[PDB]
Amino acid sequence: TVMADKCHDCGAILEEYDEETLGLAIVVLSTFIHLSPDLAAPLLLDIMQSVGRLASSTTFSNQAESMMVPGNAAGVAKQFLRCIFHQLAPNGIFPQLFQSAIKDGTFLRTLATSLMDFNELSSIAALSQLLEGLNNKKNLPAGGAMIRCLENIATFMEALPMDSPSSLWTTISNQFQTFFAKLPCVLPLKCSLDSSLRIMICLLKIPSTNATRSLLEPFSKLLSFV
């Protein structure tokens, strides 16, 4: 047998691939999701996490300079995430994603960063669409699923540019008011829900001098419930 390297914990062969193959795999997955979302729906979560893993890493230590290498598997992964979440956003990918448990604890951060500069669907705009999808839903996720939803929303908040002025805080504030009006009738009683407090802390950092001013009152009622 060929002398290769093993993972001493599990015994599996360590494998490494070049950017020309990782990028090809990413584009293959992108085409598969693009031309058949219904077939890709069961596998969508794993594919997103696997490609966000590549998006997170840096090809070179030169994080100061933008990775303008033509290959740049990280850039290919960012394009994959951007296109996937732009295409599947009308299909309610955001409430479905934030309700589901995410094994990769860094996927929400990579999604926030890779969509941050996106002009078609910004990370702030992605948050607004997530809120609109959660609010327009006939029934909010059950007590068990709502905790995961709140934790995922808070983790997405941690990676958002909450200090950045934009023409959405006067809209995200109203969306969050209406979304917090429903939580006391949804959340379970004796389960820890510090994620809501994290969301409130993130919200109170927006540069708007008036959005938080109005948001403060549903904050008070939800804090009273908590």
Binding site: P37, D38, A41, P42, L44, L45, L88, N91, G92, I93, P95, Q96, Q99, S100
Partner: peptide, 30 residues
């Protein structure tokens, strides 16, 4: 139109008088 939905298994999916139906839809009736 098709909307994401968590299935019974927990995985994602994309989900969006029979003769009288023909009778009403038939242009002859109109």
């Amino acid at each position: 139109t098709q909307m994401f939905h968590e299935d019974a298994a927990g995985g994602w999916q994309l989900v969006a008088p029979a003769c009288l139906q023909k009778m009403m839809r038939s242009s002859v009736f109109h």
